[PDB]
Design a protein around this ligand. Structure first.
Ligand SMILES: [Cl-]
Ligand SMILES: [Cl-]
Lengths: 187, 187
């Protein structure tokens, strides 16, 4: 049976960090739900790309659980994720069931907000390091993609392919990830 | 005065190849119009990401000319671009005024359809080479980004950052492109 991903899309999300993992996951045959934090309406991302979600988060969360919960970054997107009690419950549920949780750039700061995966090695965008590290609850990594325990993290738009393909490797295995990689014309 | 980009968005467009250049161009302070080929309504891209355009192409073309006309790829997106008389006229106008024309993956095959920039060195997605080369009207390149005459081309999702930053260098110069690059966390 196909693996399922939930991608939580908030106003101010980094659109590249949203679209790259959605697209690459779908290339891997993962069933991806782009879920609007605020409802079903279109979401204005950080650089003004407007994306129509597949479903509201309210609805999508009723179709859980998912094999991965994905948090794109963008500073204001991550702030919105961090403020959401719905996100908090989704992430706590995922952690409790030992499911993959994946977050990129500023997205990992929502893990901090919701007290998820403390004691894990994490990376973030370099500009989000100090936020993420407030309290010393995680160990920092400068790896382009990091994985420790349940928590898969990555740094920025420029690491989004590596992040997505890591998610694919975790869910569908290394061979699938390599087959999806080739037609992308990555370096 | 700010440079202006027109990005033509057709059903079946590769969403990564649309969003990466839009986002990176806006980071460079370029004023970008995402123009819907079919009108103002949301566009279903190749991997089912749904993007709401800024304007219809019909409207956006009245606000020309632009410093760059950008054609994302995706096989079916490029086919739709190739069939459009509106695209044909936009591209012919741009060529006539010696403006930059930029196309990625399958997107360059619309240049072939519309007889634009014959005799230029071009690259495409490897799977779009034979289409592009039908007739021998261009010279093929395996460079990740290629530029010859008016025509800037690139290969795939994985070359989209390099493509976008080439557009930025052409419009706003190398220093701007380097400053936009750093916060992306590219390899
Ligand atoms: Cl940001
Ligand atoms: Cl395609």
């Amino acid at each position: 049976a196909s693996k399922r991903a939930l991608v939580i899309l908030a106003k101010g999300a980094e659109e590249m960090e949203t679209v790259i993992p959605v697209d690459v996951m779908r290339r891997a045959g993962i069933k991806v739900t782009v879920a609007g934090l605020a409802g079903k309406d279109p979401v204005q991302c950080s650089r003004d790309v407007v994306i129509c979600p597949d479903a509201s988060l309210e609805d999508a969360k009723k179709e859980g659980p998912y094999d991965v919960v994905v948090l794109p970054g963008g500073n204001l997107g991550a702030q919105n994720l961090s403020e959401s009690a719905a996100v908090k419950e989704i992430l706590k549920e995922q952690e409790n069931r030992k499911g993959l949780i994946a977050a990129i750039s500023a997205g990992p700061t929502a893990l901090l907000a919701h007290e998820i995966g403390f004691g894990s090695k994490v990376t973030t965008h370099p500009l989000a390091k100090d936020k993420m590290m407030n309290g010393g609850h995680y160990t920092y990594s400068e790896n382009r993609v990091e994985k420790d325990g349940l928590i898969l993290t990555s740094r920025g738009p420029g690491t989004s392919f590596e992040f997505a393909l890591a998610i694919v490797e975790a869910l569908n295995g290394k061979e699938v990830a390599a087959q999806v990689k080739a037609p992308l014309v990555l370096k």
